Design an enzyme around this catalytic site. Structure first.
Site, PDB file in Angstrom:
ATOM      1  N   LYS A 215      -3.476  18.086  -1.119  1.00  0.00           N
ATOM      2  CA  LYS A 215      -2.229  16.966  -1.265  1.00  0.00           C
ATOM      3  C   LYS A 215      -1.560  18.108  -2.212  1.00  0.00           C
ATOM      4  O   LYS A 215      -0.245  17.786  -2.410  1.00  0.00           O
ATOM      5  CB  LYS A 215      -3.434  16.501  -2.545  1.00  0.00           C
ATOM      6  CG  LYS A 215      -4.042  15.333  -2.605  1.00  0.00           C
ATOM      7  CD  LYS A 215      -4.610  14.514  -3.471  1.00  0.00           C
ATOM      8  CE  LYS A 215      -4.822  13.024  -3.406  1.00  0.00           C
ATOM      9  NZ  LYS A 215      -5.902  12.256  -2.300  1.00  0.00           N
TER      10      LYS A 215
ATOM     11  N   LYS B 111      -9.427 -12.035   5.104  1.00  0.00           N
ATOM     12  CA  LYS B 111     -11.085 -12.660   4.942  1.00  0.00           C
ATOM     13  C   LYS B 111     -11.471 -13.888   3.779  1.00  0.00           C
ATOM     14  O   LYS B 111     -12.351 -14.548   3.615  1.00  0.00           O
ATOM     15  CB  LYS B 111     -12.099 -12.232   5.833  1.00  0.00           C
ATOM     16  CG  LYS B 111     -11.742 -11.738   7.640  1.00  0.00           C
ATOM     17  CD  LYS B 111     -13.052 -11.080   8.021  1.00  0.00           C
ATOM     18  CE  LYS B 111     -13.848 -11.843   8.220  1.00  0.00           C
ATOM     19  NZ  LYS B 111     -15.167 -11.221   9.007  1.00  0.00           N
TER      20      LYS B 111
ATOM     21  N   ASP C 224      -0.226   5.127   0.943  1.00  0.00           N
ATOM     22  CA  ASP C 224       0.224   6.306   2.143  1.00  0.00           C
ATOM     23  C   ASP C 224      -0.046   5.514   3.340  1.00  0.00           C
ATOM     24  O   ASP C 224      -1.226   4.576   4.000  1.00  0.00           O
ATOM     25  CB  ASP C 224      -1.687   6.740   1.678  1.00  0.00           C
ATOM     26  CG  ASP C 224      -1.738   7.379   0.830  1.00  0.00           C
ATOM     27  OD1 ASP C 224      -2.084   8.682   0.550  1.00  0.00           O
ATOM     28  OD2 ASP C 224      -2.295   6.631  -0.172  1.00  0.00           O
TER      29      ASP C 224
ATOM     30  N   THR D  63      -2.721   0.918  -4.498  1.00  0.00           N
ATOM     31  CA  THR D  63      -3.477   2.062  -3.260  1.00  0.00           C
ATOM     32  C   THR D  63      -4.314   2.548  -4.161  1.00  0.00           C
ATOM     33  O   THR D  63      -4.504   2.331  -5.534  1.00  0.00           O
ATOM     34  CB  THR D  63      -2.113   3.456  -3.598  1.00  0.00           C
ATOM     35  OG1 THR D  63      -2.762   4.670  -3.278  1.00  0.00           O
ATOM     36  CG2 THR D  63      -1.850   3.553  -4.877  1.00  0.00           C
ATOM     37  N   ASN D  64      -4.689   3.415  -2.697  1.00  0.00           N
ATOM     38  CA  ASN D  64      -6.703   4.010  -3.267  1.00  0.00           C
ATOM     39  C   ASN D  64      -6.669   5.079  -4.285  1.00  0.00           C
ATOM     40  O   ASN D  64      -7.412   5.231  -4.173  1.00  0.00           O
ATOM     41  CB  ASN D  64      -7.087   4.154  -1.669  1.00  0.00           C
ATOM     42  CG  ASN D  64      -7.489   2.664  -1.716  1.00  0.00           C
ATOM     43  OD1 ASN D  64      -8.691   1.481  -2.336  1.00  0.00           O
ATOM     44  ND2 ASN D  64      -9.013   2.400  -0.582  1.00  0.00           N
ATOM     45  N   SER D  65      -5.476   5.543  -3.555  1.00  0.00           N
ATOM     46  CA  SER D  65      -5.153   6.800  -4.203  1.00  0.00           C
ATOM     47  C   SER D  65      -4.843   7.083  -6.064  1.00  0.00           C
ATOM     48  O   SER D  65      -4.023   5.953  -7.003  1.00  0.00           O
ATOM     49  CB  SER D  65      -3.954   7.479  -3.176  1.00  0.00           C
ATOM     50  OG  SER D  65      -2.268   8.064  -4.870  1.00  0.00           O
TER      51      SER D  65
ATOM     52  N   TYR E 110      -5.900 -10.853  11.820  1.00  0.00           N
ATOM     53  CA  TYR E 110      -5.731 -10.827  11.211  1.00  0.00           C
ATOM     54  C   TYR E 110      -4.692 -10.262  10.277  1.00  0.00           C
ATOM     55  O   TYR E 110      -4.225 -10.692   9.658  1.00  0.00           O
ATOM     56  CB  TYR E 110      -6.854  -9.927  10.249  1.00  0.00           C
ATOM     57  CG  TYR E 110      -8.578  -9.996  11.074  1.00  0.00           C
ATOM     58  CD1 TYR E 110      -8.689 -11.280  10.015  1.00  0.00           C
ATOM     59  CD2 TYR E 110      -8.988  -9.466  11.876  1.00  0.00           C
ATOM     60  CE1 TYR E 110     -10.466 -11.468  10.766  1.00  0.00           C
ATOM     61  CE2 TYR E 110     -10.312  -9.657  12.590  1.00  0.00           C
ATOM     62  CZ  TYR E 110     -10.873 -11.065  11.577  1.00  0.00           C
ATOM     63  OH  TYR E 110     -11.876 -11.503  12.443  1.00  0.00           O
TER      64      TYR E 110
ATOM     65  N   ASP F 147       0.594  -1.409  -0.328  1.00  0.00           N
ATOM     66  CA  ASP F 147      -0.098  -0.257   0.162  1.00  0.00           C
ATOM     67  C   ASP F 147       1.182   0.690  -0.289  1.00  0.00           C
ATOM     68  O   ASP F 147       1.910   1.066   0.081  1.00  0.00           O
ATOM     69  CB  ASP F 147      -0.949  -0.173   1.114  1.00  0.00           C
ATOM     70  CG  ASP F 147      -1.524   1.750   1.565  1.00  0.00           C
ATOM     71  OD1 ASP F 147      -2.261   1.729   0.942  1.00  0.00           O
ATOM     72  OD2 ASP F 147      -1.316   1.614   2.516  1.00  0.00           O
TER      73      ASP F 147
ATOM     74  N   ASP G  83     -13.356  14.482   3.475  1.00  0.00           N
ATOM     75  CA  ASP G  83     -13.292  13.661   1.930  1.00  0.00           C
ATOM     76  C   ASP G  83     -12.763  15.093   1.343  1.00  0.00           C
ATOM     77  O   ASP G  83     -12.133  14.725   0.285  1.00  0.00           O
ATOM     78  CB  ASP G  83     -14.474  13.074   1.570  1.00  0.00           C
ATOM     79  CG  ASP G  83     -14.539  11.864   1.957  1.00  0.00           C
ATOM     80  OD1 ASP G  83     -13.408  11.114   2.614  1.00  0.00           O
ATOM     81  OD2 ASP G  83     -15.550  11.439   2.440  1.00  0.00           O
TER      82      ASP G  83
HETATM   83 MG   LIG Z   1      -2.611   3.083   3.510  1.00  0.00          MG
END
Ligand SMILES: [Mg+2]
Ligand SMILES: [Mg+2]
Lengths: 467, 467
Positions: free
Chosen positions: B213, B360, B52, B247-249, B436, B50, B204
């Site tokens: 950013k 999971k 961030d 990455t979510n970004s 986890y 990942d 958000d």
């Molecule tokens: Mg992160």
């Protein structure tokens, strides 16, 4: 012998309430209450009980064999082939907590993480390399409830075995062609899923619309463990707190079972007058519909104890002496006994519907009865050798011998191994016992042997970086 | 000093790859990888990262303070009162993993079971007896996601504190009347829920439509930890396996951050030619949308790396050199790198969206980065005295002193205590790390110090009846 044999042996014994006798007795594994999380009994104000496979423990293999026999007859009755009739229940096959995969028609023993420990297709045990064909990562997503069914209760022991009988029968019967996801017979296709649903419906039908209950109750000595210490335990709880029954089963059945359970010439102790089972409870509730009972529940109804029918309407009255409820919710118990969840110890055998759900939804304290423990314990002690050998074989490599020794340990328990592990790998079941049962025992009666002031203690948990 | 101070100190150091230096270094807590479940590194074929708060760890309190400052400005901008502008971020208040109760406007520290460890209403810490008013059983049903929000990430540190500022401000501002579930100002009613949603939307908006950013990237030294050992670690992984970014970004941001992260006069080691960050990865994927990424995912898109826009259409091609993906699913990674979940170690800081979900849904192996650990560890060592005192005070009673000593230990960490516990009670966070995260560390870089053949070992787990 069987686990119910062990249980009934212990049941046949009088209680020696001499305090030194008590202390001695409960250090023995068979009579011990085991602790996952610390619980101060002095804090418990209400003791709540489940009935089926808790207060009323059904004799094995007699009861499973009856259920199986009537399930098979139901299925033949709706058009499954007569060969079914030559099946006979075999108690050495099924272990509880197996997952039936309805896509591929396999029984799986998994760990907490969905990893595959055992895979049987009928009676063929598929080894490591062969399971990767259907399970590329040797793993199932067990929340995928449409595909995977967990056979969590002792009621599911007969169906666990019947599923395997049926897969085996269709595989080896020349009338049927085996495909990936089920069986072809000319212009009829039977998927493992549709087969599984039929078995599941037939089990339900046997318990609800068929003759299982009638046959149980017409021979209670054959089918139900009975123990003269039950009234003693309940009378003692009632001295320090409130006692309640919450059962999924209906009034008529509960009354026949509970009456049997209390059918001794005496009351709490020998020499004392007998009293009706209902007298031992501050609140009695049937048709609970657990786990939904721990959320919205259903409408609170009142049982007409004379007819066995529900009165018409929702019951809006208070706790009266002698009233029997039907339905409602866990809030019914709390509100009517003036308790908070942490003041309640609920005692039951259903890992999901009694223990997990009460703990997560409501913060009840939980005691899980594990009837198989009465015999799982004898194996763990007697064959401590093998486990020790395995234990020690994991440190020397710190491979083919790990695998051979695993199998020899697991076989002592049955074809599907311990309820709790496959070698050094703990089952989903084991991990949920640890996670949600504050206390656990082979029987609820093991509470008798502890003063109500007792502090059940577990050591505090530390993370790896903290140790 | 702060946890990012500790991290950056370690980052500024060259790697001494002498094997004896390695062994020594990683026995020190700060440089150790911790193990919840055994993991044989030789089995890992793909290392996934990942970005961030994993590769790009944002300097504290600078980054939180920036986020807070712009969140507050957004809120004043939409009509919250000017007093907000006098708030200033305070890093000693918030601990990560708190639960905001939107009904009552409280921050709660809970355990795995929903039990209340701490309750703050604004900056007022509500004691045991007072919490029973709103929490009769000192317990929340944390799955009730409509009511309870878990502030699980370092991104939520500023909002954890801002929620408390705002509750405190409206409570003590004479223009507003405090009610059970929010604040009245004449003919306007602001519920804690609606307040909470505004804060959440503004956070958000600051990350997505605002200037956070832009301000990060225009001063990367101020806001982002940088470490010359990253390329070394990645180059070494690429020798034994495949490396991937998920990455979510978005692309434009990932490229600016990643370029910074690799901005040294050299490549893997001093003296070697510099190479572009993208060269270190066999697969690069942005706009992941984790946790949905671990299920159905979204449509696979291809990034135009020249414009930073997505090409129009779903991408149906193979892994090419130099392609950058957007969206897709975890199956994209598996299929394109020809791996199974247990061949993947995914490394990330999001307990839910990176670790819990990958484990999971998919059976990935998991490494959790816990950036606060770099400082939580110094406190645990230095104040081992207090915890030991508490440890020992639990055995002597086997009460008011347990409570006073708990508070003194917890205060060393901040007003909201350790990420991992409140005295002897472990947090939900701690329990999910254990449950986890197969491995965990203060930094991913701690993997550098272990050969790829290493067997991370944990002791086998035994049930109470088995010990
Ligand atoms: Mg992160
Ligand atoms: Mg039951």
């Amino acid at each position: 012998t069987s686990w119910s044999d062990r249980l009934q042996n212990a049941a046949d014994m009088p209680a020696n309430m001499d305090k030194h006798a008590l202390k001695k007795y409960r250090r023995e594994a068979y009579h011990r209450v085991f602790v996952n999380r610390s619980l101060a009994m002095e804090k418990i104000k209400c003791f709540g009980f489940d009935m089926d496979y808790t207060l009323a423990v059904y004799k094995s293999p007699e009861y499973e064999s009856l259920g199986f026999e009537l399930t098979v007859e139901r299925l033949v009755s709706i058009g499954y082939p007569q060969e079914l009739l030559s099946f006979a229940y075999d108690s050495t096959f099924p272990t509880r907590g197996l997952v039936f995969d309805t896509l591929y028609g396999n029984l799986l023993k998994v760990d907490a993480y969905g990893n595959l420990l055992v895979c049987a297709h009928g009676f063929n045990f598929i080894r490591g390399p062969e399971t990767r064909e259907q399970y590329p990562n040797k793993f199932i997503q067990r929340d995928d409830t449409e595909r995977f069914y967990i056979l969590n209760t002792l009621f599911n022991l007969p169906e666990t075995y019947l599923l395997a009988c049926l897969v085996d029968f269709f595989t080896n019967c020349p009338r049927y062609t085996s495909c990936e996801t089920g069986f072809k017979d000319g212009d009829l296709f039977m998927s493992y899923r549709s087969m599984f649903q039929d078995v599941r419906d037939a089990v339900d039908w046997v318990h609800y619309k068929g003759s299982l209950k009638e046959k149980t109750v017409e021979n209670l000595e054959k089918y139900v463990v009975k123990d003269g210490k039950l009234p003693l335990l309940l009378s003692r709880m009632k001295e320090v707190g409130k006692v309640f029954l919450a059962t999924n089963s209906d009034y008529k059945y509960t009354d026949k079972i509970m009456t049997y359970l209390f059918d001794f010439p005496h009351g709490p102790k020998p020499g004392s007058s007998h009293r009706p089972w209902q007298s031992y409870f501050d609140l009695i509730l049937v048709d609970a519909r657990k786990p939904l009972f721990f959320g919205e529940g259903t409408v609170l109804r009142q049982v007409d104890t004379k007819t066995g029918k529900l009165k018409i309407g929702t019951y809006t009255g208070p706790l009266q002496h002698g009233i029997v409820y039907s339905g409602g919710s866990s809030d019914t118990i709390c509100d009517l006994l003036g308790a908070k969840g942490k003041d309640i110890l609920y005692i039951g055998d259903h890992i999901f519907g009694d223990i997990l759900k009460s703990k997560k939804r409501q913060g009840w304290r939980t005691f899980l009865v594990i009837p198989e423990l009465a015999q799982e314990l004898h194996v763990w002690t007697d064959k401590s050798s093998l486990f020790e050998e395995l234990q020690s074989l994991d440190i020397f490599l710190a491979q083919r011998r790990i695998k051979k020794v695993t199998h020899d340990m697991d076989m002592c328990y049955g074809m599907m191994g311990s309820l709790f592990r496959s070698g050094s790998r703990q089952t989903l079941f084991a991990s949920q016992v640890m996670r949600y049962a504050d206390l656990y025992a082979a029987s609820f009666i093991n509470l008798l042997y502890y003063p109500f002031s007792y502090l059940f203690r577990a050591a505090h948990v530390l993370m790896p970086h903290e140790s």
